[model samples]
Target: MEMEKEFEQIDKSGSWAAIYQDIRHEASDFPSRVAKLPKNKNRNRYRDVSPFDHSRIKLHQEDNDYINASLIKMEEAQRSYILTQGPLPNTVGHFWEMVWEQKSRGVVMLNRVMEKGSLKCAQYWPQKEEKEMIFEDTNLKLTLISEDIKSYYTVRQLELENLTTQETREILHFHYTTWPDFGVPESPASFLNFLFKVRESGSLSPEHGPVVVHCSAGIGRSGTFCLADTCLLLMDKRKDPSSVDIKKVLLEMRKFRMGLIQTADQLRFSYLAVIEGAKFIM
Candidate 1:
């Protein structure tokens, strides 16, 4: 099929929205990956604690040796890239101490509302002069490619802030476009807009170094975003990338990564986020 033919025209002038409750009727089997799959939750349980030490059964690294996500660590990710999870109280301090250990190398922190707030509560422990942070909603991915860490830091932090939130939840996951040119929420164009901004601005630079992303308890949104980033990049590069396939990718993501969005409500609207991109691509 022609690219133009594959592209469907999506109306964007008025506020046309798709909420999880509405979509769940169709997306009933939405999150059928790692956690919801009939796995031995007893063995492959999604642990509530952070897995920085690799001992926690509930948490696992992106490229954990056994069930790796085909992810290669960005070596420039400072001399070391540390991923950790813990109860809210200690997770921030532990992450801060870890970032501080290599403060001279510079670190980018990706975290959710609670963890980020806790880190702040911890008296803003990271050394202001060295450690840089770019916090994303536990629901989104944080990508950056940059040469000057500070400027990259500033723009990305700004973008992260520009993101709208109701209570602490980001509206982007359900209502915003990743790319604006497409003119609709969750369009491929919108997603690409977000992706390209990072690339254009150098925030998503893979070559620059390691990126640390986390959420409360160190998993869930953090893990899923990482997984989606991996698969989506490849699917986009493929000969045929479909909305159906994207849903499958998310399902597979949950299979390997736990709690990647346990509720159908969480899965439906956000999974359709790519609709924003698809509407644009079409």
Candidate 2:
């Protein structure tokens, strides 16, 4: 009841929209450093999309050194996240390269392979029955070991291997199927269930490098996940969900990724989830 009242208060005041606009205003001045890379220009799936300078993830490869990905670290939550755009057909190799280089324990995909009859994201992973798929560009192979398909999401164990060194690492793939493009999920309950499922795998922990999170553009649904997760972590730590300034934390996140939460509705949903999630922790 108290959480509902607080959410209503925030809704009536229209603070979520105001905060969303403020972040957009600040983000306008943020530099797109990775977009300027001469050799990497073609690697980006969308021309308008680019990672911010300060938080852009640098690749170890000498040639074709570009991928639309950024490292977002929430020091308060002790969480580090890599936010990036969906992999393009040509950049699939770079995508695996990122997984190999960063040593990420898992990936959180918020979008589907296609949306509204358009290609929103590439089929980056191997087929469940195929066992493995190799990327010729990066000489990296992705092997699917196990899969669990749920109501709103799917979890898969993927083994990433380097052909050169024959070194392999296991990574989890948390794919949310129902989240709409440029919109919020159907409910916070199902969304939190997926979030906790990801949490249960211990992939989002600080012990791992950072979980890779992406949508089509890497800013809309992607931002929503990171924002809500970070806020809940902060709430758990402070023991007061009401005291945490969702607006301030978002601005800090925008510094790492150009935009953490994309739309006003997404911002609103984030507060709702954070408020609802506080009950269990408290």
Candidate 3:
């Protein structure tokens, strides 16, 4: 709440632009210590990937405690989410393991399988024709139950089964295929609606495990979505449209994971979406 007032003051003071840059610079200074662990080396799809050691997610069931993912917990808003990079060739099994072990009911994927002529993420989920896809390494099976295709996004109902335990659970996959790699969406309306679609399913509620959100590198668009959602939720809780400090909230989120809200445009877009979302909630 105090942050929102501070953000207003900063904006009026004509130094808000500089502050965004300052926050970005400070974030860049954080050390990617956990990502450098020898065992965690190849888990990253990109060489520059890293998770802040403090909030990095560890796999208790796996022999190797390596996964390019972080847990972002926002207590005030009562939201917790696993922000992770797109699955690499070897880390696909680990990704599913995280979904099952964490008891997560939904996955919000912000990128397509490929972007700009490069493979941004592996096709981890089962396709309609494929019927079922198995991760031999983790001994888990992902079966496609149904897919509802929309213009901006696709909603897929997937069944995740543990081969050894014969346990199965359904996971909702919300894929926003149109979002650009380094940019924001065309507008906040469609994006907000997509977010609401996920919320409508109650997957992001505290009762379930944290929803998993990922883009290519898992920081740009992923961070933007989480930031907007948290800010909007806070605004709705306080019954004050202006009760959010967008910058400060982002700083808190970055503490849980490195390089959230990646670009200046993304940060700018976050403010716009939060403002628009506040209007929607009001």
Candidate 4:
């Protein structure tokens, strides 16, 4: 019976559309309070946040650099840490650090960027004996039939209704899109599509607010995203130098924030992503 119930989500919303909109807004507003973000920059000039700081991560070694964070930042901006004890519940406190540290207080959410879609990240889950402590952690709530856990690019939302009191609350529209840095020839089309989508649907929402993105170590990958986001803002206002002067853009972002994706691979990839994205627009 538990497994059967786990396979279903409470039909809080009469329709999916309403659910989508609320989640989108929630996803947008979710990270507004996280101020001390890493400063890694993306080449796209559309993303607002950078990736996590791997250098500061106690677990990462200097020689083990393998993955990049630009794509990670893009995908994470739309996801929130959800625990499956019951219907999705509200997240409280500084959920960012809690999720990153994988504390027993709550479930950890690792996006596709961290582990390349591997289940290794799930290893950080709270211990089995202490699992019941999940309910005590006021950070999140979850319903069964969970699917977004596998693909970081997917969206998650929840709708709640009170049958006895006849009240309803709806959450809709929290979706993640990965904007990877493109250096190789094989991934141009996908990268371009991500850029365009960021431009069209990437405007900041006051209700949802801005997105939180990061690359490894917080300098190169995150910095590039900031550059891309700023470029979009300028273009939307018809400002000149559309996407040009990338070097200056990066410096500006760094001045305001620290620890943007600072690795060499991330830097090279960012440069290529900008060049390719620029050519496509021309």
Candidate 5:
């Protein structure tokens, strides 16, 4: 009951301001030397949104082992995630290679390929047909085989292959197309509704690799999703909602990735979603 009481009090009093701001002060200053390298400058989407060097996913069997991505390990090896910016044109190959090398089972995209008449994420797979792209740099082949458009999102099946050998693997792409201009959701209901659908896929299970998540910046919505999901997971196991401190879990995630939960509003939304989502488990 303390879990319900504490959150209900926060909700009733409207005191999310200080909590959100407190998280920002500590997470924004992590050191990132590799992201500052001249060779990797163009790889980053935003100048300030860079992955920390320590947690960065170094590309295997490549000369330039840098991608604007970070691996966040929460509770166990089975329950980790990779967060990165929506793949840029030049970094698209590196994106697939990162997923392939790390054995990621699915990729969850929060932003669209184009937003407000501008590109937010690169169209890394075939949108209309069964076309395959050979990433010359990474020596990987990407081909799209299935496309299912849902009311709020779209799911696609991709085949990643090795150019050196003909071996292949299936990768699921879950795109949350209706997230509304990359801003926080209007309510936690729809966001959790979508989150429930993604959860059912079992892509986040230990049997598979870390589910990759991204937005245009890869820290705001992506961070919110991971934060809420991890807390809900703990609540299910611990059976005490208040015992799972949302801020503490977020702080742990930030040590692996920089600038997670980009804005105070997103941080607030994360708390709301976790509180609302806890019901689904218990």
Candidate 6:
């Protein structure tokens, strides 16, 4: 009843071709009026990838309550994920505002700032030695406390503060730096290790708010990570891991955001990760 058996069955059943079509069919074609507004135009990375207005997150700290972010929740797993695009240069503060407003414990970044000489994401956080960055528009301050760097990823300890209230909280920034452009990581083991590392922080648990997950368009890599994590959690909670339909879980996630797990290869990788991650759950 588990996905592992179905995973192999599908591979040999037809070919590695239908998953793409299946995902496209599951995409939510709902309206995004707020994101389409001229005032919020520059805040998006890609026009077609805007948040479906109903599930979009609004700013409570600013008069202008628009940001390119959506809330993805899995009821069974009791998890919340704020899937969002890479912050634009002007919306850097707005990004923090969303995180602050949601009371998110961490930010899961899945793309590099510069990919193939292209600036995929803005330099939103304060780098080491920079000390701190102040977003006056949002009345928030970001301070870089420390960083644990690795070959493929970096886990940084950050301090977030509300400039007015003297209120502060710790934020973990989990960055996966080596994801290939428009493709899956070649190996699920490495990706699962990174997932486990994020899980270790307990930021992904239910008691906390959503973990802000983002990539270039806030779909491809972001969707892959959210799907894998949510699937693994479901497997751990359910009596039978196989009973947790990975496809349906992803379909549920798409209700909150659009175009998650961009490519066919990514869809395959999401399956691979959950099957592999399932092994560890037992």
What is the C-alpha lDDT profile of model 1 across 211-233, one tens digit per residue?
34333333443443443454445
> Which model is ahead, 1 or 2, in terms of TM-score?
2
lDDT of every model, 2 decimals:
0.32, 0.82, 0.84, 0.33, 0.83, 0.87
Question: What local lDDT does model 3 show for residue 189?
Answer: 83
lDDT of 5 by residue, 173-275 (tens): 8888788774577788877887787788877888887889999999888998898888888877764456777778888898998878877678767877887
Local accuracy of candidate 6 as per-residue lDDT tens digits, 140-225: 99999999999889999999999989899999999998887655777898889998999999889777888999988998889999
Against the hidden reference, what TM-scores do the models get? 0.41, 0.92, 0.91, 0.42, 0.92, 0.95
Tell me each candidate's RMSD, in Å, in order.
Answer: 12.9, 2.3, 2.8, 18.7, 2.0, 1.5
Pairwise lDDT winner, candidates 2 and 4: 2
Ranking 2 against 4 by TM-score, winner: 2
RMSD of 4: 18.7
Q: Which stretches of candidate 2 lie above 4 Å from their native place?
A: 1-6, 13-16, 239-241
Q: List where candidate 4 sits over 4 angstroms from the true fold.
A: 1-93, 96-135, 143-153, 158-188, 195-203, 215-220, 235-239, 279-282
lDDT per residue for candidate 3 within 1-282, as digits (tens), equals: 454455467568867568678887665345677688677677877777688777788886636777889999999999999999999888999999999889999999998898889888887877774768989988999999899999999999998999999999999999987886555776888889999999999889989999999998998899998998998888878865565778788888988887887676777677778777776675
Off-target runs (Cα >4 Å) in candidate 5 are: 1-8, 11-14, 76-78
Q: What TM-score, to 2 decimals, does candidate 4 have?
A: 0.42
Model 1 Cα shift for residue 18 (angstroms): 18
> By summed lDDT, which 10 consecutive residues of candidate 3 come out lowest?
1-10
| Index of the highest-lDDT prediction | 6
Q: Rank the candidates by TM-score, best first.
A: 6, 5, 2, 3, 4, 1
Residue 280 CA displacement from its true place in model 5, Å: 2.3
